[PDB]
Structure formats: structure tokens, C-alpha cells
Amino acid sequence: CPRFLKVKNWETEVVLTDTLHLKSTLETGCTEYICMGSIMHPDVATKDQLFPLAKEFIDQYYSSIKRFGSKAHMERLEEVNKEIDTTSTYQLKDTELIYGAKHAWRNASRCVGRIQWSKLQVFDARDCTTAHGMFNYICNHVKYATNKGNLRSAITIFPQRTDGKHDFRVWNSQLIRYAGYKQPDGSTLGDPANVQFTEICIQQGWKPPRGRFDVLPLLLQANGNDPELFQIPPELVLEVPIRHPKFEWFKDLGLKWYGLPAVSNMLLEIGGLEFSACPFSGWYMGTEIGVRDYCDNSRYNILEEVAKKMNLDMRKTSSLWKDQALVEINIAVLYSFQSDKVTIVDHHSATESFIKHMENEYRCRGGCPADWVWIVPPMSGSITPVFHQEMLNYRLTPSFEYQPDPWNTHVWK
Amino acid sequence: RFLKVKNWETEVVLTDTLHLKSTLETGCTEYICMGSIMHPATKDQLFPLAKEFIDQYYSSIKRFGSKAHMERLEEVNKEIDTTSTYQLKDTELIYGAKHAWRNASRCVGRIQWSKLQVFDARDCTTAHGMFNYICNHVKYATNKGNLRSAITIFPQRTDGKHDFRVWNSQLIRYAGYKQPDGSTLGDPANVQFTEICIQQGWKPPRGRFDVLPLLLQANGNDPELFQIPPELVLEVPIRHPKFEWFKDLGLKWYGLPAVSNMLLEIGGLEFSACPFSGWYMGTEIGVRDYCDNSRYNILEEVAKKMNLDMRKTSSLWKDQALVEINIAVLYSFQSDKVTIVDHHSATESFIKHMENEYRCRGGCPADWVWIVPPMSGSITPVFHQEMLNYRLTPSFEYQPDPWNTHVW
Ligand code: HEM
Ligand code: HEM
Ligand SMILES: Nc1ccc2ccc(CNCCCc3cncc(F)c3)cc2n1
Ligand SMILES: Nc1ccc2ccc(CNCCCc3cncc(F)c3)cc2n1
Ligand SMILES: C[C@H](O)[C@H](O)[C@H]1CNc2nc(N)[nH]c(=O)c2N1
Numbered sequence: 080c081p082r083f084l085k086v087k088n089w090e091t092e093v094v095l096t097d098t099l100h101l102k103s104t105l106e107t108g109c110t111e112y113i114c115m116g117s118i119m120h121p122d123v124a125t126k127d128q129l130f131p132l133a134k135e136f137i138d139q140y141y142s143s144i145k146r147f148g149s150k151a152h153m154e155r156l157e158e159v160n161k162e163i164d165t166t167s168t169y170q171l172k173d174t175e176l177i178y179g180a181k182h183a184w185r186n187a188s189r190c191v192g193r194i195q196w197s198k199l200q201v202f203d204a205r206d207c208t209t210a211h212g213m214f215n216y217i218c219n220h221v222k223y224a225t226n227k228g229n230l231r232s233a234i235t236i237f238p239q240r241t242d243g244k245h246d247f248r249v250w251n252s253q254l255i256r257y258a259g260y261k262q263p264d265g266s267t268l269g270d271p272a273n274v275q276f277t278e279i280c281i282q283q284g285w286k287p288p289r290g291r292f293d294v295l296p297l298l299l300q301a302n303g304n305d306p307e308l309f310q311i312p313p314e315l316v317l318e319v320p321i322r323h324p325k326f327e328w329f330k331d332l333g334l335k336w337y338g339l340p341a342v343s344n345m346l347l348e349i350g351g352l353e354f355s356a357c358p359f360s361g362w363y364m365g366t367e368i369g370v371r372d373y374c375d376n377s378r379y380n381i382l383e384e385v386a387k388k389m390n391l392d393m394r395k396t397s398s399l400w401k402d403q404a405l406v407e408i409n410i411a412v413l414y415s416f417q418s419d420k421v422t423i424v425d426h427h428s429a430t431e432s433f434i435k436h437m438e439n440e441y442r443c444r445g446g447c448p449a450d451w452v453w454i455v456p457p458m459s460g461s462i463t464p465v466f467h468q469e470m471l472n473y474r475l476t477p478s479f480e481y482q483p484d485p486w487n488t489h490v491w492k
Numbered sequence: 493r494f495l496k497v498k499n500w501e502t503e504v505v506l507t508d509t510l511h512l513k514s515t516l517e518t519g520c521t522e523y524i525c526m527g528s529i530m531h532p533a534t535k536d537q538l539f540p541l542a543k544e545f546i547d548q549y550y551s552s553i554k555r556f557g558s559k560a561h562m563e564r565l566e567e568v569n570k571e572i573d574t575t576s577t578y579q580l581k582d583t584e585l586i587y588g589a590k591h592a593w594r595n596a597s598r599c600v601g602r603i604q605w606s607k608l609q610v611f612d613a614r615d616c617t618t619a620h621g622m623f624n625y626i627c628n629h630v631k632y633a634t635n636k637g638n639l640r641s642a643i644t645i646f647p648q649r650t651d652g653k654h655d656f657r658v659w660n661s662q663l664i665r666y667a668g669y670k671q672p673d674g675s676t677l678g679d680p681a682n683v684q685f686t687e688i689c690i691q692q693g694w695k696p697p698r699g700r701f702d703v704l705p706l707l708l709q710a711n712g713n714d715p716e717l718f719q720i721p722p723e724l725v726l727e728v729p730i731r732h733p734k735f736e737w738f739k740d741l742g743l744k745w746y747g748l749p750a751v752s753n754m755l756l757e758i759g760g761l762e763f764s765a766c767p768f769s770g771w772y773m774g775t776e777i778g779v780r781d782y783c784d785n786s787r788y789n790i791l792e793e794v795a796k797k798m799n800l801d802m803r804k805t806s807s808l809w810k811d812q813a814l815v816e817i818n819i820a821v822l823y824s825f826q827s828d829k830v831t832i833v834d835h836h837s838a839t840e841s842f843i844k845h846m847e848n849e850y851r852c853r854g855g856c857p858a859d860w861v862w863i864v865p866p867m868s869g870s871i872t873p874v875f876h877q878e879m880l881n882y883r884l885t886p887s888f889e890y891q892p893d894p895w896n897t898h899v900w
């Protein structure tokens with residue numbers, strides 16, 4: 080691979096030089112003959128697979144603290160090596176755990192919010208042994224991160240994988256999501272995205288209220304055991320009623336959303352160690368709710384209803400009635416969050432911050448891996464600066480990874 | 493292997509086998525994706541390329557290994573062997589041009605690919621000849637508002653010093669002028685080209701929408717200036733169906749998008765001059781040409797007239813102005829009965845096209861970065877469509893600006 084790759088911004092003429100890509104650790108899925116950049120997704124480590132993975136991370140950590148090659152560096156390498164030799168795994172120091180989590184975020188090529196990567200509260204939950212304990216840790220995370228609306232980014236890290244039959248998993252895809260209910264007539268109530276999971280919860284004993292915005296219970300698996308249900312204390316779940324500054328009728332649509340986006344089904348990989356339960360949270364970019372959650376045809380799908388209330392000509396597509404209503408819905412989401420003083424960022428501010436972030440990273444780090452397909456917001460693409468910015472996508476470690484859904488793999492006891 | 497692409501909204505899964513045909517590189521490697529990077533002969537090189545193309549031509553008319561096929565291979569072979577090049581048959585030229593369109597991964601309009609009027613201009617020898625051919629192209633393709641896709645193909649490259657080139661990036665474009673006060677009048681994209689026309693003798697009206705003259709290079713000679721007869725230049729005054737003040741912005745655009753700076757490659761042969769044209773998807777003008785900061789950059793002016801609050805970005809005043817502008821462009825073209833397609837209709841057809849291509853051809857190379865419209869991405873079906881990008885020949889390729897290589 081060439082040592083220096085250039086990226087250009089076509090609106091500002093700024094050229095950046097990437098050297099960081101040489102540190103790339105795994106496959107994108109592309110080859111020299113095909114690009115899979117728009118494909119969404121293109122038994123434990125042996126002792127021999129683990130050794131170089133840990134060394135690579137340890138070196139990286141000690142290089143970051145300006146102690147590379149020090150006595151403490153070499154001692155730590157020695158102690159890790161002996162641990163792997165005698166136990167076939169190793170345990171991270173708290174310093175290393177914190178460094179690794181922050182860097183997994185810093186490395187997440189699909190995240191537009193990474194300017195914030197160094198301000199991450201890390202909660203070490205590696206002493207957790209039961210599902211009740213996972214619930215306690217999760218409740219504390221939710222309360223801290225919510226902070227009465229002044230949201231603070233955070234991650235809670237549960238014990239790492241051992242033999243793969245004792246995994247800790249949060250079965251929820253996010254800590255807070257709304258239920259979906261398939262009706263006998265084919266219609267869906269609530270969020271169609273969560274139908275499968277909702278069904279699982281109901282089978283496990285959950286009594287469904289069967290409303291349009293029912294917060295799902297936690298389904299929590301500890302140490303490879305069967306998962307257990309828990310209700311999050313409603314006072315810990317901050318929600319925002321969606322209204323519009325001009326359209327008095329908008330509140331009558333009865334929409335609302337939850338304040339805290341908290342992804343809980345990803346796998347955190349550090350120095351070859353696998354943390355299968357690592358729920359993390361930041362705050363929302365408005366479009367995630369106003370465009371995707373609300374306007375996707377396979378989601379709440381509200382465009383028509385809003386358009387009819389806006390008295391739009393909906394007979395031709397070329398009236399852009401869909402686009403017109405889409406903007407108003409997004410205005411409503413930002414207005415409603417700001418008004419209730421719940422942190423949220425619009426797609427202009429967020430993409431402008433990311434450009435500055437990217438430039439700084441190129442300067443101090445020699446690059447910034449970025450997935451343009453994900454970074455460009457789902458509305459108004461080209462009137463945000465990221466649209467015009469060439470990006471290189473590659474995979475650095477530590478990293479957040481996808482993992483199979485737990486009900487697909489769980490061995491029921 | 494076989495590659496699956498999934499649409500996440502419809503759950504439809506397609507299987508790509510067509511990609512096994514590509515031999516050209518994408519730029520990505522196993523470890524680094526360059527999906528958002530805008531831009532990542534000899535006898536010995538020539539024949540296998542010629543043979544490849546002749547082979548797929550005869551496979552497409554279902555006469556592979558036929559007497560005609562065999563004879564054509566030997567004929568081309570002899571001709572390369574004796575002249576360092578060869579000439580395509582008319583049938584092959586047409587097949588080649590339609591297939592370059594079909595293989596253009598960045599083009600959302602490909603459902604039309606087999607409807608392409610091909611104008612063979614390989615007998616052309618002078619810039620005056622080129623002008624005549626271009627005028628006829630524009631007249632044919634414009635068709636009084638009922639636009640028809642067309643391509644005009646000039647002689648292929650020989651030694652690299654006798655290239656035919658249309659120096660204009662599109663056949664019809666608006667000039668751009670650098671003002672004393674450091675601002676730009678007209679289209680800032682064309683400031684450099686405009687200056688070259690001026691330096692060559694073009695007398696600029698110095699307005700906002702001055703149609704540039706044609707600058708045409710035949711056989712490697714210096715380029716020459718020509719004014720396209722105005723009656724051949726269809727233009728649309730932009731107005732809004734609700735905001736009657738919109739026409740007071742004085743905005744207009746031309747009906748015919750005719751890209752003239754690309755290189756058409758067929759069977760190893762390079763056609764450095766091949767202006768082609770279709771019709772507009774509305775966002776090209778309403779989002780990119782009008783609202784790009786580096787282009788006409790009108791958002792702020794429009795937003796003012798709409799009396800929006802422009803203090804905070806989170807009011808989405810920009811997004812609001814963007815939609816109204818795009819509504820106007822579509823309404824104007826439609827009202828003047830000039831062909832145009834909105835991004836909903838276009839992306840819809842593209843999905844149907846993909847479905848067609850997978851069934852009959854085994855796939856469809858597609859560049860999600862280009863296919864997804866620059867506004868309202870996820871409310872169009874292509875946003876939710878996984879696509880595989882790969883390079884098939886015949887193809888349209890980029891080439892350097894003539895002013896950076898030409899000696900006078
Ligand atoms: C602090 C404010 C943050 C903002 C504004 C933000 C913004 C975003 C957005 C808009 C996406 C696209 C998600 C989608 O379309 O589904 C995303 C993806 C992502 N974010 Fe961030 N984020 C933030 C914090 C975080 C944190 C704290 C982490 C981890 C510690 C993180 C890691 C990721 C990852 C791994 C993805 C890719 C998710 C996937 O592939 O499904 N983000 N972010
Ligand atoms: C007939 C109606 C057509 C429509 C609606 C259409 C639509 C589009 C659009 C919107 C783009 C993106 C352009 C940009 O953002 O700069 C594009 C790209 C492209 N189109 Fe089409 N197009 C049409 C006809 C054609 C024809 C007739 C050809 C060639 C014979 C063609 C070949 C291409 C190529 C090569 C690109 C890539 C341009 C580049 O890489 O710079 N298209 N098309
Ligand atoms: N505001 C934030 C911050 C961090 C985030 C991290 C992750 C996410 C959500 N990514 C969800 C995509 C999951 C998915 C996987 N496969 C197919 C899909 F359609 C969707 C949203 C975030 N939002
Ligand atoms: N409606 C159509 C049909 C075919 C088209 C074919 C091409 C185009 C314009 N492509 C623009 C590429 C110019 C460019 C390339 N690389 C970097 C740049 F900054 C600018 C527009 C079309 N519009
Ligand atoms: C097929 C395509 O890759 C898929 O729909 C992607 C496109 N870009 C995205 N970008 C973000 N931020 N989130 C998404 O879910 C998607 N979906």
C-alpha cells in the first residue's frame with residue numbers, strides 16, 4: 080500500500096494527507112475489483128492468536144502515554160504474556176480499559192459525533208456476576224448519562240468473553256426503545272423495527288401495554304445464563320413530546336421520543352479481548368429521529384399524516400410534498416428537545432464539527448477513518464460540508480463491532 | 493463467489509454474478525475503501541481488449557463463435573497488426589456507446605440506456621466540422637423541449653498529439669467572472685474556462701447567465717471559438733407556483749445537460765471527444781448548481797425573501813429554502829414542457845432498473861455515493877438499497893483538462 084493517501088474537499092479545496100491507514104487491522108470487505116462501501120455488514124481466541132493482539136494494544140497504550148519502551152512498558156508486556164500463557168487470556172488495567180473504550184469510539188468510522196471522543200465516562204462493570212447486577216449497573220448508567228437532560232456520553236463495560244458459553248449480553252438493541260406489535264390484520268402498532276424483540280419479551284413474561292410508545296423492558300444475560308426481564312424505573316426514562324413552533328396542530332399527532340440514544344448490542348474489542356456487553360450512549364443528532372425513526376417507510380412512517388395536516392398537494396411526487404413535510408418534522412424535533420433543555424445537535428452543526436474534528440485528527444494522528452455513506456446525514460446531504468469531503472474508510476483497533484443477535488445463538492438451559 | 497445485495501426497506505435480496513466479469517481496478521483494497529474518492533495504447537495491449545469487446549458483442553447478438561464472429565476477430569487482428577489500431581463497425585459503435593452508458597455506475601438514469609441516438613462523427617477533421625456536428629446534436633436532443641438522449645462521437649485518439657477535444661465541460665454552460673471586489677459573477681465553476689475564452693477573443697457580456705461559446709479542438713490543433721445559435725439554446729425561467737416574488741430573483745437555467753469532457757472507451761479504442769446528453773434530474777440544478785456554496789450559492793437570498801429566521805442553524809432555514817427552490821425548478825421546467833425528472837421518480841426508476849439488470853444481466857454496477865440524491869436521501873428508495881460498485885467496459889472515463897496538456 081502507498082504510504083501517503085490524499086483526500087480532497089471539493090468545496091474548500093483543502094487537501095489532507097493520510098498515513099494512519101497503514102495501521103489498518105482488518106478487512107473492509109472491498110477488493111481491488113469491487114467496492115462494498117454501501118453494504119451494511121460486509122469459538123474464542125487461541126493463546127497464539129492472542130499474544131500479538133495484546134502486544135499491539137499494549138505498545139499503542141504505552142506509546143500514547145509517552146512511556147514507550149519504558150521499564151513499565153516492558154514489565155506490563157511481560158506480565159500480560161505470562162497471564163496468557165498460564166490462563167489463555169488476560170485482564171486489562173483500568174487505565175487500559177478506559178484508553179481502549181475511548182479509542183474504539185475514536186476509531187468508529189461511521190460516527191459523526193467523534194469530536195467528543197475524549198470525554199467519555201467509563202464505568203467498569205467487570206465485577207458483575209448476575210442479571211440483577213447488570214440492571215443495577217445499567218440504571219446507574221442511564222441516570223448518569225441522562226443528567227436531567229444535560230446528557231453526558233458514557234459506556235458500561237461488563238465482563239469479557241471467556242469460553243463463549245458464558246457471555247454477558249444485553250438482548251436489547253438500545254437500552255431505551257419502543258415496542259412494536261404486529262396485528263392480526265397485518266398492521267403494526269408502535270415501532271415496526273422492534274417487533275421481533277418485543278415478541279421475545281412477551282414470551283419471556285412481559286405484559287405488553289400495547290401502546291404506540293411503550294418503553295421495552297431490559298432483557299439481560301449474565302455469564303451465559305438465560306436472560307432475565309427488568310423494568311427501567313420510568314423516572315429514569317427522559318422523554319420529549321414533539322411540538323412545532325408554528326404548527327399548533329403538530330402536538331395533536333401525539334408523537335414523542337426518548338432523550339437518550341444508548342446502543343447496547345455491539346461488541347467492544349480491545350487488545351484481542353471481547354466485551355460482548357458494553358452499552359454506550361451519547362446524545363441525538365436530530366435527523367436520527369426526525370428522518371429515520373419517524374419518516375422511514377418501515378418505521379413510524381408519518382410523512383403522509385403530516386402532509387395531510389399541512390394541506391399539501393400530495394398527488395404528484397414533483398410537488399416535493401414529502402420533502403416539505405420532512406423538513407417541518409425535523410424542525411419540530413429540534414424545537415421540542417431544545418425547549419425541554421435536552422441535549423441534541425442539528426445535522427449542520429454536527430457535520431461542521433466533524434469536519435474540524437477530521438482535520439485535527441489528520442494533523443495530530445495522521446488520519447481519521449470515515450464512512451461517507453454513514454457520515455452524510457439522511458436529509459439535505461449536499462448542504463452539509465461532509466458531502467463535499469472525500470473520506471478514506473478503514474478499520475482500526477480497538478473497535479466497536481457487530482455481533483449476531485443473542486436469541487439466534489443462545490443455548491437455553 | 494455470488495454476492496448478495498439487500499434492500500433494507502423492502503427486504504428484497506439480489507444476487508450479483510456480473511461482477512466476476514470486471515478486470516479493471518476500483519481503487520479500494522482489502523484494507524482501505526476509497527468509495528467517496530472522486531477520482532481514484534499499444535498493439536500488444538490493443539488486441540486482447542479488442543477481442544474481449546468483439547466477443548461480448550457477438551455474445552449479445554447470440555452469434556458467438558459464428559462465421560461473422562470468427563471473420564471479425566481475424567479482420568480486427570489483421571488491422572491492428574498492420575496499422576497500430578482498428579475501426580469499429582457502425583453496429584459495434586452503437587452497441588459500445590449504449591453499453592458505456594449501461595455500465596456507468598454513477599448514473600441514476602440508466603433505465604433509459606438502450607434509448608440513445610448515436611451520431612457517428614468519425615469522419616470529422618476540423619473544428620468547423622465539430623461545430624456543425626454539435627449543432628445538429630443539440631437541435632436533435634433538444635427537440636423543442638421533448639428531450640432525447642444522444643451522443644456524438646468524434647475520431648478516436650491515434651498518437652495522443654492529434655486528439656479531438658471539446659474544451660467545454662458541458663456543451664451549454666454559464667460563464668463566471670471574477671469581480672474587482674473579489675466576488676464572482678455568474679457560475680464560479682467556470683471562471684477558469686471563461687477566462688480562456690476571453691483570452692482567445694470571446695467578448696463577454698458579463699452577466700449572470702451568459703451562455704459560453706464552444707471551444708473546439710480537432711486533430712490536436714489549437715481550439716477555435718463558435719457561438720451556438722441562440723434559437724438552439726432552450727432556457728427555462730425559474731418561478732415558484734406559490735411565491736410570486738421568486739421570478740424576481742431573475743434565475744434561469746438551460747434545458748439540455750450535455751457533458752462534453754468525458755472519454756468514451758470501447759475495445760481499447762479511446763474517444764476523447766464524445767459529447768452526450770439526456771435530461772435533468774431536478775436536484776442537479778436546484779440543489780447542486782444553485783445551492784452549493786462554491787456555485788450560485790442562493791440559499792441566503794431565498795431564505796431572506798421567505799423571511800425565515802437565519803440566526804440559528806437548528807431552525808433548518810437552509811433546508812426549508814432548499815425544498816422551495818427545488819419545487820420551483822421542477823414547476824418551471826414542467827410548465828414550459830421541458831423534460832425533467834424529480835429525484836423520487838428517478839430513484840424509483842433506478843430501483844426498477846436494478847431489478848431488471850439483476851434478472852437479465854446478473855447484476856448492475858452502482859455507486860451509492862452518486863446514486864443517492866443530494867437532498868432527502870432516506871426518503872428515496874436508493875438510500876436503503878445496498879449496491880455493489882465495479883468497473884465494466886465499455887465505459888465513460890475522466891480525462892485531464894485539455895488546457896493542462898495542450899501546446900499551441
Ligand atoms: C456524543 C454524541 C454522539 C453523536 C451526536 C453521535 C452521532 C452518531 C450518528 C448520527 C450515528 C449514525 C447512527 C445511525 O444512523 O444509526 C453514529 C454512529 C455510531 N456511533 Fe456515534 N454519536 C455520539 C456518541 C457516540 C459514542 C459515545 C459512541 C461509543 C462510545 C459512539 C459510537 C458510534 C458507533 C460505533 C456508530 C456506528 C453504529 C453502527 O454502525 O450501527 N457514538 N453516531
Ligand atoms: C436520460 C436521462 C438521464 C438522467 C435523468 C441522468 C441522471 C444522472 C445524474 C443526476 C447523474 C449525476 C451527475 C452529477 O451529480 O454530476 C448522472 C451521472 C452520469 N451519467 Fe446519467 N443521466 C441521464 C442520461 C445519461 C446519458 C445519455 C449518458 C451517456 C450516454 C449518461 C452517463 C452518465 C455518466 C457517465 C455519469 C457519471 C458522471 C461522472 O462520473 O462525472 N447519463 N446521471
Ligand atoms: N446519537 C447516536 C450516538 C451513537 C449511536 C450509535 C449507534 C446508533 C444506531 N446504529 C443502528 C444501526 C443498526 C442497524 C443494523 N443493521 C441494519 C439496520 F437497518 C440498522 C445510533 C447512535 N446514535
Ligand atoms: N442529467 C445528467 C445526465 C448525465 C450527466 C453526466 C454527467 C454530469 C455531471 N458530472 C459532473 C462531474 C464533474 C466533476 C467531477 N469531479 C470533480 C468535480 F468537482 C466535478 C451530469 C449529468 N446529468
Ligand atoms: C444501503 C445503505 O448502506 C444503508 O441504507 C445505510 C446508508 N447510510 C446510512 N447512514 C446512517 N447514518 N445510518 C444508516 O442506517 C444508514 N443506512
Ligand SMILES: C[C@H](O)[C@H](O)[C@H]1CNc2nc(N)[nH]c(=O)c2N1
Pocket residue numbers: 089466467468469470527528529530861862863
Ligand atoms: C466527496 C464526494 O465523493 C463528492 O462530494 C461526491 C459525493 N456524491 C456525489 N454525487 C453526485 N451525484 N454528484 C456529485 O458531484 C457528488 N459528489
Ligand SMILES: [Zn+2]
Pocket residue numbers: 109113114115116520524525526527
Ligand atoms: Zn470500497
